[model samples]
Target: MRRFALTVALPKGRMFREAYEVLKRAGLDLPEVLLHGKEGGVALLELRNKDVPIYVDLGIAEIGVVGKDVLLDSGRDLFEPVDLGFGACRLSLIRRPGDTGPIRRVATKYPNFTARLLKERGWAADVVELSGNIELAAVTGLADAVVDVVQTGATLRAAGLVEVEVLAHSTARLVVNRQALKLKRAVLKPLIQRLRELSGS
Candidate 1:
């Protein structure tokens, strides 16, 4: 019998450490390495949160771990088999303090998700797509509000902005490529069962 090795993609920052810790506890053979450094001979792919789903959807990676927010924004086809139960945050609507004007323009890194929210709420707001620092759009009056992720609210408060509404609560999810799940079932099924037990999800 040939042994199956899974190619796992993990996000590049804090979520990477959290996901690795979970996998290690679940008895996956991940080495103890610094989060920012490379691991020797490990098939771990460190990727940005936005790129994780893309890699998995294209079958470049068999498995990936990323936040629910990024997954929803990507609108990719993949199997979210398990909720890794870490990297908890909320997608929110934010505005400058006391700016009670109607939401005429909204800025965010998540353009698709933001547009959906606006359409669902029947609010006709211009969606401004930004790469980073979405709060700056509101603070500098470039936008009336922003849709962004709120981790601790520290960044929002420090920037003199307030979270007006929570669009969605998000946690890290374990995603698998659609075809890989069936083709690598012998390997992935056992891994998924172990992760489910470890995460209690």
Candidate 2:
């Protein structure tokens, strides 16, 4: 029923199930067990969240499903056609109460966005990049604040941190390469349309 195959980079973290379920709803036939495979003219790449945009930007994948925060952090130029609208979270500035002194250091996994936020707010604080558990940095005195994603604010509260500011709201988004959209219009357009139909926005 199709002449071209689309390579979709599916994410592999907590967001994977929601992303995959939406794809299935759009009639995308991808295997659940396999990491990479092609079925019904749709090739799949089960990659980490951060690598989704990389593959699409490099032209290896025609499309990718990534979080808005991760997508913006990647800074890759891609056509974001659909807002799948799952995995809702916000990138926020977290700090201890009554400790709102000078922010000399901030710890976060998203150093790129953190750096930009600091500059935009005209706040001079060194962004210390951490792998995870950013709240611990603030809890243990490694940093004065943390710029990280908060889903329900439970983690921050449990760690004695409070959300001071929200930098960006994130949701799952469908990203495509311009070249792929141009060259594979016939094949990609219908898929994009189906995805859009099911997307929240």
Candidate 3:
């Protein structure tokens, strides 16, 4: 009998809950502690939000879930095999209502994606980086608007921001460390197959 250790990085928001349910349906009984907290008992390791690639890159976690936005922003060396189809959202540029300026400052956590998209659109602007609460930048006069993930856009509407442009859309991605796929294939393959089946990927 061969037992293996695998790490799956789950995001902090609704995606985490949804992905966890999918995993449970796939028959991986996640311990309550692992699901609720930061560590797993033995085989599975749960991680914080946005740290999926970090743990995968450091070899601390073998498998992870990350948004397409994070993958585009980080460009970390990882293997994304399955699109879990959860956390569907668009990465769009937003601005204050009734604001039309020749040049605008954009705020977002996704700097690389924002910059590249704006470049392609021939719009040169300043990129204001924020950790969370990206809507604050627009309402608080920090930046003209934000390039942030929009799942429902309820928050955007509540903040009185309008969608200016949509750069790209994203969904949850099941990613794995490059080395782990090779070394832990025996244990990883079955789990990956189960996830793929449940996700219809």
User: Cα lDDT of all candidates, in order?
Assistant: 0.84, 0.84, 0.77
Residue range 47-138, candidate 2, lDDT tens digits: 98888889899888888899999976766677899999888999998999868789999999998888887888887889899998999999
Model 3 spans with C-alpha error above 4 angstroms: 1-4, 27-29, 34-42
lDDT of 3 by residue, 29-58 (tens): 655644332333324455655777898788
TM per candidate: 0.89, 0.90, 0.83
Scored by lDDT, model 1 comes in at 0.84
Q: Compute the lDDT of residue 159 as modeled in candidate 3.
A: 90
Native-to-model Cα distance after best TM-score fit, residue 79 in candidate 2, in Å: 1.9
RMSD in Å for all candidates: 3.4, 2.7, 3.5
How many clashes (backbone N, Cα, C below 3 Å) per candidate? 0, 0, 0
